[PDB]
Symmetry: D3
Subunit: 117 residues, 6 copies
């Protein structure tokens, strides 16, 4: 994931960050204190950006042309995932974090498929 | 490029960082001091990574589905640029820096078209 | 701008980040959602800080003593630009973003002159 | 892992970075090219520091007084893990990476036990 | 503080960042402007996290087994300090900043004792 | 130092980073192992950049126009300090770290003078 190549990649990195995004959204629903809301906004923004970086890294650094041929929809899937993450970043609705988790889950399925074969 | 959205994008950001990459490769042929070679290596890894970030952001944050219908080669183009920037990161040969610039120039051409219509 | 030296500089880097600052200020007048206001605030703080970094780097890493003899107001100009960017960071008023851009435009004019002779 | 608290933590974040460390060390044995060795060293330093951050965050933000009560050896385990990561930073021997991984595994078991309550 | 080892550490780095935390908290009592409160919250989060990094680095990179031997309460002191910093992150009350500072002062005395040998 | 303004500034931040630069230089003189040299180069580059950021921050964010009038040589002093730090960054000679420490010491003298009055 580090560009050597070192060869170690796992969508879990994108996932755990996007799970933090959703968790923050959930918490924001429970406590309207402006200072808390602000800190939640700060943290959500950071985690969502890290999730994007991880998803982008799988796409540029791990996935190769044979993968793009086998999965013609992967380019657009990655793009939509990144857009979903930016949508979650801009929203307090955990359903937006969940949508981005849903997309990452589709990438993860494909990822582990390429690991078998 | 900050994800607000703020709507301020320019592939010049990627290009300037990719220019630094090619310039650093060029300097590496000029001075065999191991300390200098190592600093050039540090700097090149960082600038190439920034270039990759700028390219990725254009793709995810600036380009939208209408652009992708109009330019069906754009997803693959962005993927190629990022892989070219990875190849430059791994190399001392300025030809690799140039190849990354050439891809960026193709993104730049598409980008300014989308600013017209 | 990486300090190798690589010799690749362009005040466009500062300018684009300062444009994002003014754009974010402009958006803040458009949408009173507190969550949106807070994200705009996060993003503006970051982009202004990047702009300040780019300006500082030009001053320390690109401009050299001959430039300072030729442009004796340049030190104070750079100081003013950075303080203008701090003032924009602290404000929602796009006039502050504009003032920072105006100073950057003066650095830009000096910069391109030094590229000629 | 972000400090809201959001309550999302997983020692897998430290693991994955430490796996990269070990993977780099192994790659260093098979390509004596000076530029490659330098890049491998640069990347290793980065990923080892990320792994440390993730371990430190678990210890400061996730683990709580009753955990330190139940596991009187946790403080020292976390300290030994961080030192094992620094030892891996300073070394090309994959045995050092592996030792860091063995420590993170001890943290991972404790972590998941604490999530059972 | 960088992990060479270079052997240059000073708890003053944590102190200065924690002093900023407390200074922000105090400033928050005197300007109820929503934008100012938001920026103060953003900056506080950043500086508290820097202070934590500096404290964590001391503990992992500077302190050694004989220090932990001589000061059996060091592990818990460092943990309490990090938690005090998180409490300051989450609060507008300068008493929380001050408590973080009082903990860093306990670390600072121990540090300087260990530099006497 | 954080741009609120919070009002907390201390040249010690620049100093401790520049002291790390010098310490690394000293160590590089003692151990010619290429892996160690590389890691030292990495670390020195990072610390020197952080020292520059701190010096630049005093200059833009702390020092004000009354200070520049009272100390007409301060602008150029800061510029030369930053250049000295970039010189140390590019060198393994600790005398270069010491020169940058010398310059910071001149800034520090002025800084504490402005704190009295
Ligand atoms: Br890779
Ligand atoms: Br945007
Ligand atoms: Br340069
Ligand atoms: Br937490
Ligand atoms: Br150390
Ligand atoms: Br300030
Ligand atoms: Ni990797
Ligand atoms: Ni933007
Ligand atoms: Ni450069
Ligand atoms: Ni978290
Ligand atoms: Ni150090
Ligand atoms: Ni401050």
């Amino acid at each position: 994931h580090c560009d050597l190549p070192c060869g170690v990649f796992d969508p879990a990195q994108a996932r755990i960050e996007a799970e933090s995004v959703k968790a923050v959204q959930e918490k924001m629903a429970g406590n309207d204190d402006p200072h808390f809301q602000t800190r939640a906004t700060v943290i959500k923004e950071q985690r969502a950006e890290l999730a994007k970086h991880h998803v982008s890294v799988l796409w540029s650094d791990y996935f190769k042309p044979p993968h793009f041929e086998k999965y013609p929809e992967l380019h657009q899937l990655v793009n939509d995932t990144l857009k979903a993450l930016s949508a979650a970043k801009g929203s307090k609705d955990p359903a937006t974090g969940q949508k981005a988790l849903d997309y990452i889950a589709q990438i993860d399925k494909i990822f582990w498929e390429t690991k078998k074969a």
